[PDB]
Each structure stands twice: as C-alpha cells, then as structure tokens.
Enzyme design. Structure first.
Site, PDB file in Angstrom:
ATOM      1  N   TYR D  41       7.090 -19.191   0.764  1.00  0.00           N
ATOM      2  CA  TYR D  41       6.269 -18.071   0.638  1.00  0.00           C
ATOM      3  C   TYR D  41       4.846 -18.206   1.081  1.00  0.00           C
ATOM      4  O   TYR D  41       4.340 -19.261   1.006  1.00  0.00           O
ATOM      5  CB  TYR D  41       6.219 -17.866  -0.850  1.00  0.00           C
ATOM      6  CG  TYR D  41       5.521 -16.473  -1.209  1.00  0.00           C
ATOM      7  CD1 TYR D  41       5.975 -15.024  -0.935  1.00  0.00           C
ATOM      8  CD2 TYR D  41       4.111 -16.748  -1.983  1.00  0.00           C
ATOM      9  CE1 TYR D  41       5.128 -13.866  -1.441  1.00  0.00           C
ATOM     10  CE2 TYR D  41       3.363 -15.692  -2.495  1.00  0.00           C
ATOM     11  CZ  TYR D  41       3.939 -14.319  -2.157  1.00  0.00           C
ATOM     12  OH  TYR D  41       3.344 -13.156  -2.387  1.00  0.00           O
ATOM     13  N   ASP D  56      -9.556 -12.776  -3.033  1.00  0.00           N
ATOM     14  CA  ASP D  56      -8.237 -11.904  -3.022  1.00  0.00           C
ATOM     15  C   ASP D  56      -8.798 -10.355  -3.287  1.00  0.00           C
ATOM     16  O   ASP D  56      -8.236  -9.923  -4.040  1.00  0.00           O
ATOM     17  CB  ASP D  56      -7.128 -12.302  -3.800  1.00  0.00           C
ATOM     18  CG  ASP D  56      -5.932 -11.557  -3.440  1.00  0.00           C
ATOM     19  OD1 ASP D  56      -5.789 -11.044  -2.236  1.00  0.00           O
ATOM     20  OD2 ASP D  56      -4.930 -11.325  -4.371  1.00  0.00           O
ATOM     21  N   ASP D  83       3.342 -12.169   1.785  1.00  0.00           N
ATOM     22  CA  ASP D  83       2.632 -10.999   1.000  1.00  0.00           C
ATOM     23  C   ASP D  83       2.035 -10.234   2.053  1.00  0.00           C
ATOM     24  O   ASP D  83       1.185 -10.659   2.791  1.00  0.00           O
ATOM     25  CB  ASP D  83       1.642 -12.002   0.095  1.00  0.00           C
ATOM     26  CG  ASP D  83       0.943 -11.044  -0.743  1.00  0.00           C
ATOM     27  OD1 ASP D  83       1.089  -9.681  -0.605  1.00  0.00           O
ATOM     28  OD2 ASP D  83      -0.131 -11.497  -1.437  1.00  0.00           O
ATOM     29  N   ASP D  85       0.610  -7.395   0.859  1.00  0.00           N
ATOM     30  CA  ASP D  85      -0.314  -6.511   0.120  1.00  0.00           C
ATOM     31  C   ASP D  85      -0.006  -5.064   0.407  1.00  0.00           C
ATOM     32  O   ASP D  85       1.026  -4.574   0.077  1.00  0.00           O
ATOM     33  CB  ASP D  85      -1.862  -6.593   0.501  1.00  0.00           C
ATOM     34  CG  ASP D  85      -2.415  -7.912   0.193  1.00  0.00           C
ATOM     35  OD1 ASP D  85      -2.537  -8.013  -1.413  1.00  0.00           O
ATOM     36  OD2 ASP D  85      -2.787  -8.709   0.653  1.00  0.00           O
ATOM     37  N   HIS D 111       6.604  -8.164   1.337  1.00  0.00           N
ATOM     38  CA  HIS D 111       6.541  -7.226  -0.027  1.00  0.00           C
ATOM     39  C   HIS D 111       5.464  -6.365   0.119  1.00  0.00           C
ATOM     40  O   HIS D 111       4.204  -6.951   0.584  1.00  0.00           O
ATOM     41  CB  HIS D 111       6.665  -8.138  -1.500  1.00  0.00           C
ATOM     42  CG  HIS D 111       5.398  -8.919  -1.795  1.00  0.00           C
ATOM     43  ND1 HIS D 111       4.437  -8.699  -1.794  1.00  0.00           N
ATOM     44  CD2 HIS D 111       5.576 -10.364  -1.812  1.00  0.00           C
ATOM     45  CE1 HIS D 111       3.496  -9.805  -2.307  1.00  0.00           C
ATOM     46  NE2 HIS D 111       4.438 -10.839  -2.093  1.00  0.00           N
ATOM     47  N   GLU D 113       3.138  -3.578  -1.998  1.00  0.00           N
ATOM     48  CA  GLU D 113       2.709  -3.081  -3.103  1.00  0.00           C
ATOM     49  C   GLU D 113       2.264  -1.487  -3.369  1.00  0.00           C
ATOM     50  O   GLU D 113       1.765  -1.149  -2.495  1.00  0.00           O
ATOM     51  CB  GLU D 113       1.966  -4.098  -4.060  1.00  0.00           C
ATOM     52  CG  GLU D 113       0.657  -4.149  -3.361  1.00  0.00           C
ATOM     53  CD  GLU D 113      -0.124  -5.444  -3.752  1.00  0.00           C
ATOM     54  OE1 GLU D 113       0.365  -6.605  -3.549  1.00  0.00           O
ATOM     55  OE2 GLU D 113      -1.191  -5.500  -4.463  1.00  0.00           O
ATOM     56  N   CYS D 121     -16.644   2.857  -0.251  1.00  0.00           N
ATOM     57  CA  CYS D 121     -17.349   1.845   0.246  1.00  0.00           C
ATOM     58  C   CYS D 121     -17.908   0.852  -0.979  1.00  0.00           C
ATOM     59  O   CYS D 121     -17.643  -0.210  -0.992  1.00  0.00           O
ATOM     60  CB  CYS D 121     -18.548   2.224   1.068  1.00  0.00           C
ATOM     61  SG  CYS D 121     -19.304   0.975   1.780  1.00  0.00           S
ATOM     62  N   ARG D 156       6.896  -3.909  -4.273  1.00  0.00           N
ATOM     63  CA  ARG D 156       6.190  -4.503  -5.526  1.00  0.00           C
ATOM     64  C   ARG D 156       5.612  -3.584  -6.338  1.00  0.00           C
ATOM     65  O   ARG D 156       4.715  -2.762  -5.536  1.00  0.00           O
ATOM     66  CB  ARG D 156       5.313  -5.731  -5.101  1.00  0.00           C
ATOM     67  CG  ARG D 156       4.029  -6.064  -6.247  1.00  0.00           C
ATOM     68  CD  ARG D 156       3.226  -7.099  -5.748  1.00  0.00           C
ATOM     69  NE  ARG D 156       1.895  -7.163  -6.571  1.00  0.00           N
ATOM     70  CZ  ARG D 156       0.976  -7.996  -6.586  1.00  0.00           C
ATOM     71  NH1 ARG D 156       1.295  -9.221  -5.781  1.00  0.00           N
ATOM     72  NH2 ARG D 156       0.119  -7.949  -7.077  1.00  0.00           N
ATOM     73  N   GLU D 186       5.066  -6.975 -10.745  1.00  0.00           N
ATOM     74  CA  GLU D 186       4.195  -7.822 -11.208  1.00  0.00           C
ATOM     75  C   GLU D 186       3.680  -8.021 -12.383  1.00  0.00           C
ATOM     76  O   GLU D 186       3.756  -6.951 -13.188  1.00  0.00           O
ATOM     77  CB  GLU D 186       2.903  -7.326 -10.126  1.00  0.00           C
ATOM     78  CG  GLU D 186       2.395  -8.390  -9.231  1.00  0.00           C
ATOM     79  CD  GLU D 186       2.150  -9.788 -10.268  1.00  0.00           C
ATOM     80  OE1 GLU D 186       0.752  -9.739 -10.392  1.00  0.00           O
ATOM     81  OE2 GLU D 186       3.081 -10.750 -10.292  1.00  0.00           O
ATOM     82  N   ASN D 208       7.232 -13.216 -10.525  1.00  0.00           N
ATOM     83  CA  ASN D 208       6.338 -14.100  -9.920  1.00  0.00           C
ATOM     84  C   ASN D 208       5.826 -14.968 -11.058  1.00  0.00           C
ATOM     85  O   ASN D 208       4.810 -14.664 -11.898  1.00  0.00           O
ATOM     86  CB  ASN D 208       5.135 -13.097  -9.459  1.00  0.00           C
ATOM     87  CG  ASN D 208       3.742 -14.172  -9.036  1.00  0.00           C
ATOM     88  OD1 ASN D 208       4.025 -14.737  -8.535  1.00  0.00           O
ATOM     89  ND2 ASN D 208       2.707 -13.317  -9.129  1.00  0.00           N
TER      90      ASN D 208
HETATM   91 MG   LIG Z   1      -2.646  -9.194  -3.182  1.00  0.00          MG
END
Ligand SMILES: [Mg+2]
Ligand SMILES: [Mg+2]
Ligand SMILES: [Mg+2]
Ligand SMILES: [Mg+2]
Lengths: 289, 289, 289, 289
Positions: D41, D56, D83, D85, D111, D113, D121, D156, D186, D208
């Site tokens: 992964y 992240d 991933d 996102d 995946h 999500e 902003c 996801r 998740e 997960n």
């Molecule tokens: Mg993420």
C-alpha cells in the site's frame, strides 16, 4: 490491455513507406493525428532544443525525455517512436532502465545508436562510434529489457560518416543478428544505399528525411522503390513553428502590436477543435444530467 | 544571489509599457530574448493546450507548470511571470506551496485570479468569481508565502464580465490593500477602462492583449496613454507556431515530401544561433586546452 | 536571498567536527533538525537503495536525486550536502548541468569523486579511478558552473584503496589546486591518515564514518584530534529504520496483528510534533480571523 | 501484458483476510515482499509525512504520489493499492486524470473518499464529507476513467464520525451501486460494524488497522469472523522506522559516535540481500561472457 508497440507494427503493415512525423509536444501530436498520420516521433534533438532550449550534445537526461513521452501519450493514442540516443548511461543497467521506463511512459518503440558520446570531461561534441561488439552488447541489453514483447527496439548506425558504406552495412547485419528489430541508417546520401541496407538485413528500414543534412529530400515514392519501410521527418514541423514564432516576436517588438501577423495565427476556434475541446462537455453530459 | 523578481521590477522601469510575451517552451524563451524582450510569460492556457494538449479547464497540475518554469528559467535569464490560476488548491496551504515552489522553480512572479473553479465533480465551466473577502484571503496567503521579497504577487480579476466595471474596480482596491503588488484586469474592452483601474489602485496595471478575444489589439502607445504598465501577449507566438506546424503536416501528407515548405522553416544556422550552440565548444576551449 | 551554501560554511565554524547525518527523506531531515543537527546529507547510495530500491551501481539518475533534494529542502532549512557521484554524465556539460540543477533544487553543496564508472555496457563494478588530470577537469567544470559562489564543491577521492596513501594525497593537492573547496578522502583506515590529508590540502576534510566498512567508528573527539572538519554518517538512521520496518513486517505476518510491536513505534504525538503539524492551524489563525 | 489490478484481485482470492502493508518507499516494498506479503500500500498520509515531511492536510499533489508509485512499482512486482484521497481536483476531469495517471504509473488500484477537503482558503483542517450524490458522481468519474478493466476503484467513506453508522452504511450501498468495486469504511470502532458493511454491499471490505486511531487492533482471525476481505496496516513500518532513526540521530548527537546503536542496524549484507544486489552481476554473466 493496449500495446502501443503492437499499434506501431500494425501501422507499418497498412502503410508502405510509413510516414512518421516528429511531434515536439502533445499539442502537435494531436495536429499530426488530425493530419492523418498513423505514427509519430519524439526527437531527442527536439527534446534538447525545444523542451530544454539546449544543443543536441547529450545534456538532456532520460527524465527530460520521459516527461515528454508521458505528455504526448497521455492525450494522443498514436504509437510514438522515441529517440533514446545511446541509452542514457554506459551500463547495461542504464540501457535496461531506459527501455523499461520508456515502455512504462507509453512509448511504442525506441531507437538506440552506436555513438560513443563523451569519453572524457573535455571531449568535444563528436560523431565517433563504438566498436561493433560494444553496440551488439548495447542492443542485447535493450532487447532483454523489453517488458512488452511488441515494444520495438530499433538500432541506429552512424557509421557511414566515419567508416563508409560497407562497414555500416556490416555493422547493421550484426546489430540485427544481435536482436535489433528495425534498422535506422543515419545520414544516407544516396537512394540506392537504402536498398542495400534493406537487402542486407531483412528487417524494416527507416530513412531519416530531416532537412539541412546529408540526406536528400527523397519522396515517399522514391523511398518505396528503395524498399524503405518508414519515412521519418523528425523536426520538420518544429522548424516551421520556430520561424513563425520568431516572426511574431519580431513584429511585435518592432511595431508594438501584432496586427500585422494576425493572419499567420491559428484561430481560437481552430485551437479548440485541435484539442477536442468539445469532447469534454460532451463527456460531462454523458456521465451526468 | 540573483532575484528574477527584482529583475522583473527593474524591467518595468526601463520600458514604459513593458512588453511581456508568452513563451510556450524554453526554445521560445531564448527566441524572445534574442528578439530583445526583457520579460516573458508562462501562460496557464499554454501549458494546458501546448504542453499537455488539453483545454484550459483546470486539468493541469502545479507540477505540469513547475516543469515548464524550470525548463525555461534553467536556460533563459529573462524574468518569467507565471499564470498560477487560483493557486492549485483551495486551501491557504496550497496557495503557499504554489508560491514557494514557483519561486524555487525560478519564476520572477505570478498572478492568481478570483475565479471560483470547479467545486463540484460535474460542474460546468464558467466565469464565476469568489467573494471579495475570499480573494483577499487568497492574496494574503500568497503574499505571506513569499520566500523572496522581490518575487511578484499579481492579482487578476475577471469581475468585469460578471459584475461590471465599478465592481471590478472595488475588488481591485481591496486586492491591492490586501497585498497585491500589481493588477491584471482581465478582458477589458475599452482603452479608457485601463486608465480608470490605473488611477484607482496606484500599482502597475497589466493589459492582456490576446487575440480572438474581447479586447481590441491595442498598441503599446495606446496602452501608455491609458497608464498601462505591462502589455501581455500570452499565446501570440504559440498560435502562429501551430498554424505553421499544421501546414507542414498537411503538405507532407498530401505531397509525400516537405520540399514545398522548406522556405517556411527556420534554418539550421538560425537554430544553432538561437540556442547559443557555439557557446558550448567555446566553454570547453576556455576551461581546458 | 538565503544561501544554503553560506549556511553550510557557517555551520563548519560553529562546530569543530561538524556532524553531518544522512537523511533518507524529508521526514528524517526534520528529525535531524529536531535532534539539533546543523547540517544534513543526501547519500547517493541512499537514493538508490532507499528511494529506488536499487543497488549503488550508478543506475540512479540526476533527476532521482533532484527529487529528493527538493523534497528535503522545501521543508527543512538545514544545509544539505549532496552525493553527486561523478557528475551524472561524462561531459563537462553534464557536470555543469548537475551543479546548476542541484543548486536550484536547494542543495548547499555536493561532492564529486574520481571514480571511472561503467564506460562499457557489460562492464563489472569496480573501484577504478580516472587520471589526476581527468579529475582536475571534472572539478574545473564543476566550479565554473557554480551559480551561487557559496555553494560548496567538495572533491572525493577513492585513491587510497587502489593507489595508496601517498598517491591519494598527491591527487588531493591537485584537486584543491583545481578549485576543490573541501576534501573527502574515502575509506580511510587509520586516524593518523586524516591528519596527513588535513596538513596537505589546507581545506576542510570530511571523514565518512559509515558502518560495516573499512573505517573504524571514530568518535568526534578522535576526529577533532586528527584535524577533521566534518564527520559524516551517511546511512546510519537508514540502517536502523530498515531493521525496525522489517521487524514490523515479520511480526505482523507471523502473528496476524501488530500489537506486539507497538512499543517500537513513534507515537502519533511524536509524528505530529516532528512535522510541525501545529504550525499549520497556527498560521491560519495568524493570517485570518 | 501484465495487469497489477488482476494481480490484486487474485491475491484477494488466495488469502482470506488479505494482509496489505503500507510501504513508505521502494526499499520497504522489497522488504514486505520478502516478508511474504501478496499486496502492498501507498499511504497518502505517508507520502505527505514521509516523502514531503508535511502534515496530511491535502498539500501533497498528484505528482508527489505518482513519483512514489513509479519508484515502488518499477522495482517491486507486488500489486500496489494507492491512497488517492479525493481525486486531486474538484472536477470529474481531475478525478479522471488521476485514475489514468496512477494506472499508467503502475498502480493496481486506488481508493477515493467522500471528504470535502478545503472549501475555502481559510478552511481549517477538517473531516467534513460531501453529499452522497456528490460522492456518487466522484465514483462514476473514477470508474469511467479506468483504462485497465482490472484496475480497482475502491470507495472509502468517512461518514461514521460525522453521520453515524446507519448513514455510513447507506452511503456505502450508494457508492457500490455507483460502481465502487470494494469498500473502505474509515475509523470503524466495533468489529460487528465490519460485518454489517459486508452484508450490506456484497463487495470486498477493507479494514484500516492503523494504530493510535479509533479502530482497535483487530487480529486477522477477528476480521475473518467479521467477513473482512482485506486488513490494511498503512503506516506501521513507517512509525517503527521513524523511532529507530530518531534514536540513532539522538545517540549520535549525544555521544559523538554510533557505537551504542550499531546493534539496532540492518547490516550491509542484509541491505544487499534485500535489494537483490547479487541478481545484478548474475544478469551480466547471463547476458555477456
Ligand atoms: Mg487522506
Ligand atoms: Mg542524438
Ligand atoms: Mg486560467
Ligand atoms: Mg557513489
């Protein structure tokens, strides 16, 4: 799964003298596709002079080339033949990574030549070539690295200028016997020479019909008569595009307006049509609403 | 240490109506320099349509633009103004990374606009713009991210077409108040409008003189009378280059040879001169021997 | 404008025996900074084995290294010394592009060595080195290419293992005479040898204290007594990180859960602290609201 | 031609509770392969924190991820789940380019999500999610973009934390009906919940099992009993690798030598073995001599 290599080999079957035009960027690949071409080309000299603004002295890196390969093949489905120079690196490991990376980037094939490149830090730009044996090893490494059996490994020889015709032909035969799938005899000066290479290797022959070099501007009919399988025009569009751009820059600088050169420009409408601008909102309507 | 941003600001001083021409790639940046220009531009629409062969619908990524910035500035010393669209991300963190990355890539400045963007997956292209408050934050984040104080943060507003002149001017003042160092009022239709913006913000104003659009082809003298600080020609050379390339592809396909269009091509000597080919062996002689 | 090279030179002044630790990626660069280090290193063998999962046989390209340089320096402000092997190309033009590219990528300095490389496609790995004259040119080209006068050009010599101590020292003097600003005598076996090099070149000397090699694990105090200016630990953290990762993979595979190795893991709080997580929302509060 | 996607689906068939471990870089992919894993992964959080040293928070770009995809899949043959996102971009065109680029980069699946990301902003880091309808469009765009029918599009949902279980299940069913091939619920807090999702969608369920989060450290046996198809350990090795690296940095800084931590390091021999160092000279002997 699709194999650009398979597509290149198929194009060769349906078009005697397969015309292959160099495409400096993704946009021009689409123009060449709309013009009717069945195969396109990524000139190493073009990546250097066009994408990097550098002379074709081996300063470009594999990644500079891969970036252009991805850009073109991400949007254009035509099979792309790539100039891999001497494999970007002296090791068989370098040649192998180059092959695998170009296949992964979406290329249909590549040609690797027998030039030496720089042997010393102060080595001036040159046309020297390695021994027949060294090139055979280079070719063996490239063929062994193929991850897609249909990807094309074309060998190019620049021996004519430094060893004469007979030596170039002898090398060509050794290159093919080594695994080379197609042959690219650089800077051929006479039509009859192409026929000689053709009868000598029994594999498709490519004729580099670039301008301002040692090779005459042979027509597709002349090349067909000489048994040439592919007709390459590596930087033709690029050369015209540069003159046109230069003229715009000059007029604009000289006159403070582009009024005088508007008639030399591709219109907004034409630009949209070329990049299938409308196929985008069409997809949205097909997916939603 | 050299600062492209400082050089750009200097260029504005030595050229009333500073001409800024778009350069589709490094090669063209060198052509613009050889044409006497003091500043160049990297069009977002050019990266999309030219480098990627895609329409200008926000499909291009920050990295596609960064690659062109590096290619151009690695070889051309002229200050490069970059189209950063809306910052390549909706968060202040994206705007900051975009700014810092472009500076490091070699850019002299960039412009960020007040357009909304997609927002939704199946959202159709539009001219919608965010609130004055929203753009202000966008600008604050961009200015705060500057790692080179001389790097230029230009604010572009597309408010004319959707909110009118008076509204666009109100936004402009707020944008400048927020830190915008230069202003780019898009698609202006009357010369007098430029003068109004100029008198309202007290910062250099850019006029986008692109063809086939809503703006007349104003001359540098006309723009100077309207107090315009910069005259931008974003894709001018690109448009001429595409038309010329297309011509070569068609003629070559129809006649089986490029003989007929040789006179439309940049010569080998011109190409070499344009990429400073000779400077290479001259460096070898100066360093060694 | 900030100059990493200047910062590196400054670090040498505030730390007798300046400790330089290799950082496999950006995250580890931040860990080294949080550990109090003032300078970090990008190992060529680390880029190959860590980023590419390949052995250190010259398969890595300039671009693989450039990517790691940018990733690290975009977020970590510590000066980064980079392993540039032999310049990524045999021509002075490649050496120059490597130097200029690394500077732009954010590096504070680099070291180039006198190893020969592959040369032939089927050439086997070795410790062979070019002539003193050849390396001198390599260095001259590198120094001439500096766009930042403070960027450091360090010369590394692997002459001990193949030519002996007296020979290595002779080369060193020639290298420094050619412009090398710092010296990296590889695989030294005796502490007293370092002192000899130091007294011979009058430029900062680097000691490569890598494990499982020919060099004893000399302490910073021992190195200071031998007049060593820099103590390098190229892959130390990398080696520990791999062992720990391998342990997790095996335990997880054998027990169906990682419960047993939780105590060997960096906590969530530690991770957040190490990547300055909190500084992000703090910036949002400072800029807005 | 090989299809990593086909390989991923095959792995699911031969391993109930298919263990999938996150591999931070190419080197660790090889370690995971040698450890016995059938699938690996690429954590988006890992690309950010590890490759970029960033939190992240959606600062990473598609290209930062693609680079890591290419590095890992260029050397490791195990199928890699990625991933993605929310598709890197709000447009269906953005989602599509992401899918096609990841497939081309060598990924076996990804995946996507239902998170919103930054809507403004000044939008603080958040867990907000889009409407069921918006996510369905997101999924439709991703599935339609598949260039390899066997590539896996996994959906996801992060709805549990903000809408509760029943809502999360309802969304999941809509996501699968929209084309999602596998489901990733998740932050599930109870084992029984996984079973509920399984019975509700009839497609493979991924659990997960990351540490320090809302989900318990369920064993493979427990997950099997709940009908979970895949067990993911996204950053497990990374966390241990960081602690190990940190310890080396600290000891080295504290004691001026790594003597005390040598026993925590992977040896030179082990490193070589891990990167199939010997398979290289073996290939040379097989190709030449
Ligand atoms: Mg993420
Ligand atoms: Mg060439
Ligand atoms: Mg735009
Ligand atoms: Mg090395």
């Amino acid at each position: 799964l699709h194999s650009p290599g398979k597509a290149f080999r198929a194009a060769l079957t349906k078009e005697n003298p397969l015309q292959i035009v160099g495409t400096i960027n993704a946009n021009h690949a689409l123009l060449a596709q709309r013009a009717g071409y069945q195969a396109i080309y990524l000139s190493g000299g073009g990546v250097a002079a066009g994408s990097l603004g550098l002379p074709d002295l081996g300063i470009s890196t594999l990644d500079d080339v891969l970036t252009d390969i991805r850009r073109i093949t991400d949007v254009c489905s035509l099979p792309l033949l790539v100039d891999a120079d001497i494999g970007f690196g002296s090791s068989a490991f370098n040649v192998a990574r180059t092959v695998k990376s170009m296949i992964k980037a979406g290329a249909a094939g590549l040609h690797i030549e027998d030039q030496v490149g720089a042997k010393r830090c102060g080595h001036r730009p040159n046309k020297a070539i390695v021994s027949k044996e060294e090139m055979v090893d280079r070719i063996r490494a490239a063929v062994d690295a193929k991850t897609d059996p249909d990807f094309v490994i074309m060998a190019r020889t620049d021996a004519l200028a430094v060893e004469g015709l007979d030596a170039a032909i002898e090398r060509a035969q050794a290159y093919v016997e080594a695994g080379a799938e197609m042959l690219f005899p650089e800077a051929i000066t006479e039509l009859a020479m192409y026929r000689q290479f053709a009868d000598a290797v029994q594999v498709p022959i490519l004729a580099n019909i670039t301008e301002f070099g040692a090779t005459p501007l042979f027509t597709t009919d002349e090349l067909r008569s000489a048994h040439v399988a592919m007709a390459l025009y590596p930087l033709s569009a690029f050369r015209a595009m540069n003159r046109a751009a230069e003229h715009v820059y000059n007029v604009l600088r000289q006159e403070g307006t582009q009024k005088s050169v508007i008639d030399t420009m591709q219109t907004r409408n034409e630009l949209y049509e070329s990049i299938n601008y409308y196929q985008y909102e069409e997809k949205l309507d097909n997916l939603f609403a």
